[PDB]
Design a binder for this molecule. Structure first.
Ligand code: HEM
Ligand code: HEM
Ligand code: HEM
Ligand code: HEM
Ligand code: A1BYB
Ligand code: A1BYB
Ligand code: A1BYB
Ligand code: A1BYB
Ligand code: A1BYB
Ligand code: A1BYB
Ligand code: K
Ligand code: K
Lengths: 156, 156, 156, 156, 156, 156, 156
């Protein structure tokens, strides 16, 4: 079905954010696992998988709309050097991703691509859940102290 | 069954305390969950539910005694700004509630409303168990330190 | 995540309607049960529980958006004096509630808070189902007669 | 298998009656559900499904006989404004349909299409069962009164 | 609940499209079965059932909004004479239906009938799935050849 | 029970057709199996068994009517030497068989042998199902091409 | 455990190849699904998943050896425009990947990193299986023809 050209550009921009998130969260997961913080590693692993599922739905939507999904262009990963930095890097990416999602929804609404809007809204609901998780983790570090926070994330 | 006027006024006073407690505990619960202290959140939620069940029984007793349950007048919530304050606010409310239950029981005894007395005694038993819980939590904070106390209430 | 201030105000306004509805429907339920109209009493109980669940979600969303949920201010309960009036009081509350929901959705849309909109839409679907039910009950009173109508709501 | 042209025309006339009945019963069903007369709505829904099944078999037979089934021409629906009228409208359409079934059967027999006759007889048995149901409901309204009759059709 | 007059007119237009789709897909289904192309016949049968379910929901919504569902007016069916044309006919109807859905959604949004919008968005999602299926079938005919395409749809 | 003499002659004529059909379908089945077209072979085997079952019921009916079943006179088998011809031979036998069933039913009706008519009508329904199958197969050969058609009948 | 710097550089090159293959295979899978060639789409999906698991093991090994896994640099995807080209692009990438694996194993052996060698041998065994599959598909296209080959990959 011939999609709006600018909807497809937006969907490829969201997909681009997802490709970054996939790799950043996957690498953060494996860093946490290497460090023995397996509860963080498992949780971050699942965040990566959730982004992979989002990327799947975007690719499928783009192809249905007769566009070309862009899996070639990979933007800058934000990799922290300790747990607090890694969490803040994830949060910075999520905030950029939800900004882009909102702008994409605005355009989908204006050209009446209501199904593309519904897909982007569901992804945004997932991203706002991730934002809640990250903000909460960063606050927990302040409330229980870093050493306890990390201790609580050693074991699944 | 036409009840004693003052008994009903006592019952509506206790109900008023329950309405405060329901809302104060439900908000405390959701604050703790938002902060990632989910064990505190879950326990405080169950405390809110317990007060909801108490209020149901009081509403049911008032109506049987042919009074009008007061669900309109809501007293002042005591909302803390941190965990220790929230626990102490809960404790302050409970001590007021148990005072009011004792005075009402006295009056039920005097006019021989023994069933109302039994209901109130059952509620007083639950409220003393909550007081036990709250005093114990405040003591644990002193014994294990606030950061360890919070750490131990992150996960369920 | 720092929410829009007027979104938070709208959500607190929706929460305020829910707090009225919780108490109004609970009192109506317990009145219907006291009069032996247990089918009405049960259905109205479930309506109260539904509004409790909506309020929980609103409180959670407001806290996520870094606002203060208002559980202190209780508006005016509309309590009927017979079955027909009780149903009309519920319907009047519901119609005000759905007005406020739509205005809140407009504002969410305007500031691109699409997740808050989606939550309000879901609540709105639930409230329109309650209106359907209430309008239907009031029509049934006219079609079968009040005595038949009450007879049909004695037993669960 | 090349069928008799007038058999096919007769089958299309029966199909045409079924298309009317499908929509008339379905709308009557949803009206009754909207009014809270859910037992009438459920029964009328199953009448509508029964007519859909009859229409399927007719369409299949027509195509086997190398005719063109006519799903384009929709006759006048008879929609009531109250329960008694809706039942009488169904009954009126049923009497038209069974008259038409009888005439088609005569013709099938004359040209020795005994299989088409067998199908139409089965449909006729179903329609006479619907007539019994309809006549019985209209009789019950007189015997128990309209308000009791509707009361008895509120709940499934 | 009094609905917006133009929303109801839009809902009746969508319903009118569904009534065409129901009969057009059902006839196509039974033609394919008659020809021994049973996998197309089964798939098109389920398409027709899906439209029936959409029509039910539209009818229920129109009645709740105190409108009169229009099951009397039946537009032009598009019936192919071979498998390609039948698929192209379905696709032509679907493209008309989704245009009308988008216009109906616009009007629900403008009058704040967000629940009608949600229903229509769900139907639109289903229609775009059917469009994907249709476009894919027409593409496969080109990729595998007409004879193989039909061969692959003889058996379920 | 003494039957009408001409009914019994008609039943023996139908039995004679079945006896032809049993052997022709059984041999076509085993030819197809020998050729590796096992899906045709299996289906033709079941057509043969169906005819065996019809012949049983006719034999049983003739004996009840105190006639002598003729299992001695076997008419000409129509045996093809290729798939299309075998199917066309089956179709030609069926059309001759259904002609005879129609004339037999006419006579049973005339002399009021309504049970014999019902038996023959049931047999006629089965033969019209076989005619549908055969006509459909021949049509499929034209739509998908002979080589694909046979390919699709290699495997069960 | 401090690894050989050149081993890590090899591992990172292999990882680079995996990242290309993940995205190339995932896009090809979703293109095939969009074209209705679901058996190809599903098989290609499983190939993508396989490369994802390889990448995971390489990342984990690089971190164990105190290197930095490179998930930032994405080489050129080879995307076909039709099925034959897509398979040939997969095969060309695989032949590159296995050449790089052999040179990395040579180096692991020379510096006695026998565990890294064993991991790479296991990945090489998987890639040779994928090469077997791809060469076999391209041969099938020649043996059965493109139309039959594609037809055989429509359905799972
Ligand atoms: C375009 C980029 C990618 C896409 C679209 C993608 C997609 C997917 C999908 C759809 C799944 C299945 C999830 C499920 O159903 O539970 C999955 C699983 C997985 N992915 Fe990815 N992925 C991508 C990149 C990556 C990368 C770069 C890695 C590793 C660095 C990776 C590692 C994994 C793993 C380990 C699994 C689980 C496999 C299993 O079941 O054992 N993915 N991926
Ligand atoms: C008049 C004040 C209230 C009364 C009398 C009341 C009563 C009840 C009762 C009887 C239950 C069932 C508990 C059980 O037996 O499991 C319940 C459940 C619940 N209440 Fe309330 N309640 C009140 C206010 C509230 C408020 C203000 C909230 C939220 C702010 C709330 C949230 C809930 C929730 C989430 C549940 C659990 C529902 C479920 O089963 O999932 N309630 N309430
Ligand atoms: C030519 C007109 C129609 C035909 C031939 C037809 C045929 C059918 C058939 C064969 C079934 C399956 C029944 C079963 O065995 O369970 C069915 C189901 C149904 N039909 Fe129709 N139908 C028609 C029109 C309609 C219309 C106009 C509506 C709504 C206004 C409708 C609503 C339904 C529903 C709700 C179902 C049940 C689906 C489910 O199982 O969830 N149908 N129809
Ligand atoms: C007067 C002629 C025949 C009559 C009345 C007759 C009748 C029957 C009947 C009643 C059955 C049982 C059907 C069932 O399983 O439900 C049967 C089965 C069968 N018939 Fe015949 N049959 C006749 C001729 C033939 C011929 C000529 C052949 C082979 C050339 C044949 C081969 C078979 C086979 C293989 C079975 C399946 C038996 C089994 O495996 O249980 N029949 N027949
Ligand atoms: O990331 C990427 N997404 C893509 O679609 C893509 C490429 N497409 C090739 C192509 C295919 C078809 Cl079918 C039509 C026109 C085309 O140009 C090529 C390289 C990289 C990418
Ligand atoms: O919280 C509240 N409890 C109540 O009973 C109540 C109200 N009563 C109405 C009423 C009903 C009947 Cl049946 C008899 C006498 C009455 O006055 C009104 C507003 C708020 C409340
Ligand atoms: O209904 C009510 N909802 C509320 O949030 C509330 C109150 N908040 C206290 C508070 C806590 C924090 Cl952490 C930050 C700022 C604050 O003012 C106080 C009384 C009644 C209510
Ligand atoms: O209700 C309807 N039934 C139908 O058959 C029909 C139509 N037929 C098209 C057609 C197909 C073939 Cl294969 C042969 C000859 C034809 O004319 C067209 C519009 C509406 C209808
Ligand atoms: O397709 C149709 N949909 C309809 O509602 C309809 C009809 N309505 C009759 C009616 C009923 C009531 Cl209760 C109130 C006012 C009315 O005019 C009549 C014929 C055909 C149709
Ligand atoms: O793909 C990538 N893999 C990586 O390791 C990586 C980055 N690492 C940052 C870093 C972390 C630590 Cl803990 C120590 C030293 C460092 O420089 C940065 C950007 C992109 C990538
Ligand atoms: K009665
Ligand atoms: K083929």
């Amino acid at each position: 079905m011939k999609g709006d050209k600018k909807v497809i550009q937006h969907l490829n921009k969201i997909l681009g954010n997802e490709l970054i998130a996939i790799n950043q969260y996957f690498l953060h997961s494996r860093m946490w696992n290497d460090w023995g913080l397996k509860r963080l590693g498992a949780h971050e692993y699942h965040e990566s998988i959730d982004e992979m599922k989002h990327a799947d739905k975007l690719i499928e939507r783009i192809l249905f709309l007769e566009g070309l999904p862009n899996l070639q262009d990979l933007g800058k990963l934000l990799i922290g050097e300790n747990t607090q930095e890694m969490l803040q890097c994830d949060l910075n990416l999520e905030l950029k991703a939800t900004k882009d999602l909102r702008e994409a929804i605005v355009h989908c609404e204006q050209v009446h691509d209501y199904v593309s809007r519904d897909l982007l809204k569901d992804i945004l609901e997932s991203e706002e859940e991730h934002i809640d998780y990250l903000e909460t983790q960063l606050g927990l570090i302040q409330k229980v102290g870093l050493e306890n926070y990390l201790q609580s994330h050693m074991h699944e």
